[PDB]
CSV table of C-alpha atoms and ligand atoms in Angstrom, one decimal:
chain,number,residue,atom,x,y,z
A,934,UNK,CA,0.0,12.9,1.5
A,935,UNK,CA,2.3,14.8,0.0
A,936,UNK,CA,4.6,13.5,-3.1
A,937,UNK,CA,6.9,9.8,-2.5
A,938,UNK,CA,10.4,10.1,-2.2
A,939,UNK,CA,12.3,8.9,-5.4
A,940,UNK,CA,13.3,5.5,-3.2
A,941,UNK,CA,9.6,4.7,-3.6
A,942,UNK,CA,9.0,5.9,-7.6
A,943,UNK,CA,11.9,3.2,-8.6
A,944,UNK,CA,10.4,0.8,-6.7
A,945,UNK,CA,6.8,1.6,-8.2
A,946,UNK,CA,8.4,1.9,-11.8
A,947,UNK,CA,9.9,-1.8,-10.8
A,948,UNK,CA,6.7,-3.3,-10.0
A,949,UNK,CA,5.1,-2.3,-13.3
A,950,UNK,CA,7.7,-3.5,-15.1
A,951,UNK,CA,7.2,-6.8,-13.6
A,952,UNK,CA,3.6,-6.8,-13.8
A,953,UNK,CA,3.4,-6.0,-17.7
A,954,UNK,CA,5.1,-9.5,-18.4
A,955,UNK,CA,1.2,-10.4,-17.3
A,956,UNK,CA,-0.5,-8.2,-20.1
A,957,UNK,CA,-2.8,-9.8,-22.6
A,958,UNK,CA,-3.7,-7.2,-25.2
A,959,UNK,CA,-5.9,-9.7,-27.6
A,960,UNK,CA,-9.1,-11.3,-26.9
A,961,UNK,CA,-9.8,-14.6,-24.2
A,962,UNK,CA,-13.6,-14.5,-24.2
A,963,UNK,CA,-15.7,-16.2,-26.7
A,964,UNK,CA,-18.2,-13.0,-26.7
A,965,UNK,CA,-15.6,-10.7,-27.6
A,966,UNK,CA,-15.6,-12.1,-30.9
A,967,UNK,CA,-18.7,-12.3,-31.2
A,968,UNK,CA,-20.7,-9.4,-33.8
A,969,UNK,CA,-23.0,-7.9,-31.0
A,970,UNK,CA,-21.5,-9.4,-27.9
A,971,UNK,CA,-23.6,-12.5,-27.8
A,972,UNK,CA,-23.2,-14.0,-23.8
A,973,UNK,CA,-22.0,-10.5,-22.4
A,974,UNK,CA,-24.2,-9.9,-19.7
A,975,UNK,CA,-22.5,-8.0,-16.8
A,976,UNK,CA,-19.7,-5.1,-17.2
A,977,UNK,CA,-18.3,-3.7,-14.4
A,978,UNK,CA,-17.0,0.1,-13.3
A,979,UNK,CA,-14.9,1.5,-10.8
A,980,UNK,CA,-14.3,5.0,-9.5
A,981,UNK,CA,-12.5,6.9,-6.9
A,982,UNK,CA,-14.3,9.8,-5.4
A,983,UNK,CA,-11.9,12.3,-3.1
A,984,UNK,CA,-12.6,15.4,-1.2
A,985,UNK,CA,-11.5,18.4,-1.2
A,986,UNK,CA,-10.0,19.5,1.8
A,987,UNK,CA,-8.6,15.8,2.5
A,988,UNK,CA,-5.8,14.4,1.5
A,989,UNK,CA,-6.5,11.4,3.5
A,990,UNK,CA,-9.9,10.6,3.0
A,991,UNK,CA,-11.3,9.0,-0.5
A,992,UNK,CA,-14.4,7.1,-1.5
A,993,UNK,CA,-14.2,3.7,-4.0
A,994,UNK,CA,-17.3,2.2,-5.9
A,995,UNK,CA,-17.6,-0.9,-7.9
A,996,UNK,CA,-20.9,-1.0,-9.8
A,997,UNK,CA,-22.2,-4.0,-12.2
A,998,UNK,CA,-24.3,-3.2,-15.1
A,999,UNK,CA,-26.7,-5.6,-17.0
A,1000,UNK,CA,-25.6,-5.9,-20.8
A,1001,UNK,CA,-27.0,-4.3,-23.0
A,1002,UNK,CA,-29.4,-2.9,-20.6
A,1003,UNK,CA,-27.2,-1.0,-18.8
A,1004,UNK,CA,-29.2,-1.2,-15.7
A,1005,UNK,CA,-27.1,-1.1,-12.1
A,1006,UNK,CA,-27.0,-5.0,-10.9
A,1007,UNK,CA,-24.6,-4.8,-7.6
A,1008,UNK,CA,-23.2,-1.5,-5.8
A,1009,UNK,CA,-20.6,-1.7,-3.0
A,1010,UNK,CA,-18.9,2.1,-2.3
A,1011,UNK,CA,-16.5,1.8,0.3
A,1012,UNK,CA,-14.5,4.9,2.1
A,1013,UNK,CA,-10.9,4.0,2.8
A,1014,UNK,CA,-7.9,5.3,4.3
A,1015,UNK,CA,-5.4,6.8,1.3
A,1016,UNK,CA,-1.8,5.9,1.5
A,1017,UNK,CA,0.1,7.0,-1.6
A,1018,UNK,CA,-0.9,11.0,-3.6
A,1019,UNK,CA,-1.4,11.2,-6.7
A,1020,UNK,CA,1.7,11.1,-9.4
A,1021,UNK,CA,1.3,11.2,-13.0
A,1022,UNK,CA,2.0,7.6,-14.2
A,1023,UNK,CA,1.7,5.6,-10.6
A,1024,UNK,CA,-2.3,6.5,-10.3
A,1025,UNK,CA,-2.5,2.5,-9.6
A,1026,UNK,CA,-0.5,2.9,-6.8
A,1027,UNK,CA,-3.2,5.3,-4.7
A,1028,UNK,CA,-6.1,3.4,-6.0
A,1029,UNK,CA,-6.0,-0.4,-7.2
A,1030,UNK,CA,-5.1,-1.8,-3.7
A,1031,UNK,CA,-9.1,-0.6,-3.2
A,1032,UNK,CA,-10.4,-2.0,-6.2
A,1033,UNK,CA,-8.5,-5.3,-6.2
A,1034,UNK,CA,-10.7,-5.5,-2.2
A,1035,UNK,CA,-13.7,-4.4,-3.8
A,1036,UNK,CA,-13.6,-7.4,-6.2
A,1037,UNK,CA,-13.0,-9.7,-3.7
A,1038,UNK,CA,-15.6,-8.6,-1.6
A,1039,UNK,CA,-17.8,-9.0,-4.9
A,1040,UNK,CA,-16.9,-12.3,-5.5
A,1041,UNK,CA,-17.6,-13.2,-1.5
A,1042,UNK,CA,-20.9,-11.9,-1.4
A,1043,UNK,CA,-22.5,-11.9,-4.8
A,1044,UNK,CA,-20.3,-14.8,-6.9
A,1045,UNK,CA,-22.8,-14.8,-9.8
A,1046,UNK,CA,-22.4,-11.0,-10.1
A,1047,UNK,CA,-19.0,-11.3,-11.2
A,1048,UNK,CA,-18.4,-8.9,-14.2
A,1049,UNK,CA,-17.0,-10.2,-17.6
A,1050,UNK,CA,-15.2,-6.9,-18.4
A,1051,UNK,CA,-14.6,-3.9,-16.3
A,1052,UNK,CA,-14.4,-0.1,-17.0
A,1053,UNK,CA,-11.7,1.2,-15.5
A,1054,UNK,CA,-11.6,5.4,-15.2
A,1055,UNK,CA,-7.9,5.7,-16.6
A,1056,UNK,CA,-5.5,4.5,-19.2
A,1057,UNK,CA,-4.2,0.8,-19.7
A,1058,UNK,CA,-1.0,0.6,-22.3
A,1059,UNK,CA,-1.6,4.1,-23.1
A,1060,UNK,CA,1.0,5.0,-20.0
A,1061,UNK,CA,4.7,6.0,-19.8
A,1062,UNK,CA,5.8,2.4,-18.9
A,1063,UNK,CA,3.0,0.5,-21.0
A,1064,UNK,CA,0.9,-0.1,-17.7
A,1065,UNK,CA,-1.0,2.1,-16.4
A,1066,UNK,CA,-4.3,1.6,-13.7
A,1067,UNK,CA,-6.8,-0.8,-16.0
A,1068,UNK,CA,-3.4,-3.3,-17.2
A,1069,UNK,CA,-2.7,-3.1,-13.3
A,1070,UNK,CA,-6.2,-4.2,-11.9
A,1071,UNK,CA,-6.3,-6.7,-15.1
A,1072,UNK,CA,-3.7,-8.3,-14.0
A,1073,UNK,CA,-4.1,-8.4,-10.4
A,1074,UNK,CA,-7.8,-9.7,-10.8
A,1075,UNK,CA,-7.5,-11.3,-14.0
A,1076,UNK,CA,-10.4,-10.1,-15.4
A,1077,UNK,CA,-10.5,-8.3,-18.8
A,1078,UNK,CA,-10.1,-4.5,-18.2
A,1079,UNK,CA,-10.8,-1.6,-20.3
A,1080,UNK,CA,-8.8,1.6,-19.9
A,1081,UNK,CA,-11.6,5.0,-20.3
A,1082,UNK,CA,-9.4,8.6,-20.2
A,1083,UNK,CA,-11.3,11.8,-20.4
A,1084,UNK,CA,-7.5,13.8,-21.0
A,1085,UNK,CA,-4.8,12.7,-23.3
A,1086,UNK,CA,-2.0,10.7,-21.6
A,1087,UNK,CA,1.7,12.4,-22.9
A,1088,UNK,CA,3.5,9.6,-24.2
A,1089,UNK,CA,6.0,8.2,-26.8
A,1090,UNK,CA,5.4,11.6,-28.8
A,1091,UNK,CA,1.6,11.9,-28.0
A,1092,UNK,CA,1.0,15.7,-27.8
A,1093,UNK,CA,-2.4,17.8,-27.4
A,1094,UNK,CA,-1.5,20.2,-30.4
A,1095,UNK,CA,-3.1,21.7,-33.1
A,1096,UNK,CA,-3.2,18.7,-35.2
A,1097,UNK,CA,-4.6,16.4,-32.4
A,1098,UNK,CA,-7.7,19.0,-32.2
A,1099,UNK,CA,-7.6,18.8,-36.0
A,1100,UNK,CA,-8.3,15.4,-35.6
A,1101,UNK,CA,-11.0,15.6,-32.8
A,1102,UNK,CA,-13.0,18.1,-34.9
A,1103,UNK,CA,-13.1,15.8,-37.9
A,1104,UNK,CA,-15.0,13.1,-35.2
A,1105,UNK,CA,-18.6,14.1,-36.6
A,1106,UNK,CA,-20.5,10.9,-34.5
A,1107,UNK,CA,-21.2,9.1,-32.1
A,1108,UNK,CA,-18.5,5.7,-32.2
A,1109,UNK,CA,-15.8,7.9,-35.0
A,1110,UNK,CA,-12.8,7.1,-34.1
A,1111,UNK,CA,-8.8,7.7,-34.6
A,1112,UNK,CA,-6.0,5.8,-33.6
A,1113,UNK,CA,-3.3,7.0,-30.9
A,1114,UNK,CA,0.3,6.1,-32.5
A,1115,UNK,CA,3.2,6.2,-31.0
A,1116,UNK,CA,6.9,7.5,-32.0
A,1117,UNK,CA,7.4,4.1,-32.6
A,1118,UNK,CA,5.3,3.3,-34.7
A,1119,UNK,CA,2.9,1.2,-32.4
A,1120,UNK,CA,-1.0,2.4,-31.9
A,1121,UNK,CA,-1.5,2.6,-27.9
A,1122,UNK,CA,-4.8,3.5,-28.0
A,1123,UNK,CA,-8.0,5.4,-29.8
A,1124,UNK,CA,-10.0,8.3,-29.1
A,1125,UNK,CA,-13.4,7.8,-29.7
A,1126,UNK,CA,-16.7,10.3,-30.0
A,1127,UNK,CA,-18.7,8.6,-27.2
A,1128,UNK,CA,-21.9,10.3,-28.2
A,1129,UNK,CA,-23.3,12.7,-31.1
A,1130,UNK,CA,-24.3,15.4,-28.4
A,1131,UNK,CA,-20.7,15.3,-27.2
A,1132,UNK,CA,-17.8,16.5,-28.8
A,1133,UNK,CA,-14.9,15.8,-26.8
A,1134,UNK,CA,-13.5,12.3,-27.3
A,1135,UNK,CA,-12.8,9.4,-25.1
A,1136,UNK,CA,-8.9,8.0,-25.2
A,1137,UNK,CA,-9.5,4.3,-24.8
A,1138,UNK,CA,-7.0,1.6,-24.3
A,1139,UNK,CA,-6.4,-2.0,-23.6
A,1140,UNK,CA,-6.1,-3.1,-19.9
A,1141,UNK,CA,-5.8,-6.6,-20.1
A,1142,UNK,CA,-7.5,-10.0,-22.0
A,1143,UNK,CA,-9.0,-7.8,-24.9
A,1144,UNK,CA,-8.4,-5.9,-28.3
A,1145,UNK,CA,-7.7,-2.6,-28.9
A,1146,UNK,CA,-10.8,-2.6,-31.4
A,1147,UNK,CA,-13.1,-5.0,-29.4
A,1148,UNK,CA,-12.9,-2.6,-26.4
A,1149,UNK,CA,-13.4,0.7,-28.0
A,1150,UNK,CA,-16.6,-0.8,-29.6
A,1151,UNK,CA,-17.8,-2.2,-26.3
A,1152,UNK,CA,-17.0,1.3,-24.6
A,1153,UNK,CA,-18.9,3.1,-27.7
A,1154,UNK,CA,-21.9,-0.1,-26.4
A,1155,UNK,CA,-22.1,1.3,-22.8
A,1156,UNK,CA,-22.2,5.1,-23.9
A,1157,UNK,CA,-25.9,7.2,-22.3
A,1158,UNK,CA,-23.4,10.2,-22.2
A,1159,UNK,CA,-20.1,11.0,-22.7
A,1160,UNK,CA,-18.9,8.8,-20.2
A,1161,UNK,CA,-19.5,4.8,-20.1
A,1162,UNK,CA,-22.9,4.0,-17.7
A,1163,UNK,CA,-20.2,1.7,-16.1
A,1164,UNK,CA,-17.8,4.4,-14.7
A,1165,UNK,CA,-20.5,7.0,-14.6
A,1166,UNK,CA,-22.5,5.0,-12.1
A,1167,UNK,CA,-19.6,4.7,-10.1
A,1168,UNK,CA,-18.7,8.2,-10.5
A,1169,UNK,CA,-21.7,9.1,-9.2
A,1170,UNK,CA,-22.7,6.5,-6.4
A,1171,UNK,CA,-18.8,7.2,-4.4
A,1172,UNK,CA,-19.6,11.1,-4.6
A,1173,UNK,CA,-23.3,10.8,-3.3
A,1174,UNK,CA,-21.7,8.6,-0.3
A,1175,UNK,CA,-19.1,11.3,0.3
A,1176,UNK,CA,-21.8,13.6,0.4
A,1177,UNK,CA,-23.6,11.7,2.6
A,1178,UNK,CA,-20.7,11.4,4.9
A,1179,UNK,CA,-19.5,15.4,4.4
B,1226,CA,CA1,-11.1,7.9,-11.1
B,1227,CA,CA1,-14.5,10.3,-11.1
């Protein structure tokens, strides 16, 4: 609706603080360290579609793709009821509640299409408290999580400058990369050149049960466009059922 009361913001800030204990930024899965992925064979996406004149009103999709096909395996778009707006550094706290009942509605009626890895649309550790939307469905599903950001996330001395574009010019292909590092000293995430007919960069970050590297290759793997097939597909299927419905 309109923005929380600062009651509600401490206790958001207090739940992803207790939540990150729960973060695991290496890798669990034996195809992660594998050279080309070897037993990956579903990655999921998720989205949240809105519309315009409602506040209210919002659309979620969880897709499955085959691997490496990329081909759409399991759909379920859902419209639901929004409770929280949006506020720079809580996005979890409109959205994930959906997801995290999109999962289990996966895992009721399709158990075998459970993905290994999903795409989340939004930061992971790249995030003012070190947990943003993809560590906070990681660790509410368990399942490894990749953080996709189409705009750069303002933290721990992260700017948008000059030099920052510098740096995204010198990105000539497809799967170029450069690191994300903070004012301390720590790398939170990478941007990447998703595609050579593309020029501006993904910001890719860990969301939970993978490596910073591991998931920027995999998120350069699912790349038709600029954006991953994974959140693309879901992009588009909860905006067609909005449509639908509008
Ligand atoms: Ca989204
Ligand atoms: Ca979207």
């Amino acid at each position: 609706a309109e923005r929380p009361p600062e009651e509600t913001l401490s206790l958001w800030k207090g739940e992803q603080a207790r939540l990150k204990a729960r973060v695991v930024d290496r890798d669990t899965e034996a195809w992660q360290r594998d050279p080309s992925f070897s037993g990956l064979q579903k990655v999921g996406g998720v989205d949240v579609s809105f519309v315009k004149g409602d506040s209210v009103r919002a659309c979620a999709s969880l897709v499955v793709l085959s691997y490496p096909e990329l081909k759409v395996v399991y759909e379920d778009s859902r419209m639901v009821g929004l409770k929280a707006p949006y506020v720079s550094g809580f996005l979890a706290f409109r959205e994930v509640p959906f997801l995290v009942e999109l999962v289990q509605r996966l895992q009721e009626k399709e158990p075998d299409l459970m993905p290994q890895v999903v795409l989340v649309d939004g930061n992971g550790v790249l995030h003012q408290r070190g947990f943003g939307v993809a560590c906070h469905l990681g660790v509410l599903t368990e399942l490894p999580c990749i953080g996709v950001a189409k705009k750069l996330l303002q933290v721990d001395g992260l700017e948008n400058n000059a030099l920052h574009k510098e740096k995204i010019v010198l990105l000539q292909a497809g799967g170029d990369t450069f690191p994300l590092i903070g004012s301390s000293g720590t790398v939170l995430g990478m941007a990447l050149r998703s595609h050579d007919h593309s020029t501006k960069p993904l910001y890719v970050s860990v969301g939970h049960r993978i490596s910073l590297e591991v998931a920027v290759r995999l998120t350069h793997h699912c790349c038709r466009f600029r954006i991953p097939e994974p959140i693309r597909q879901a992009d588009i299927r909860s905006r067609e059922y909005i449509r639908r419905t509008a």
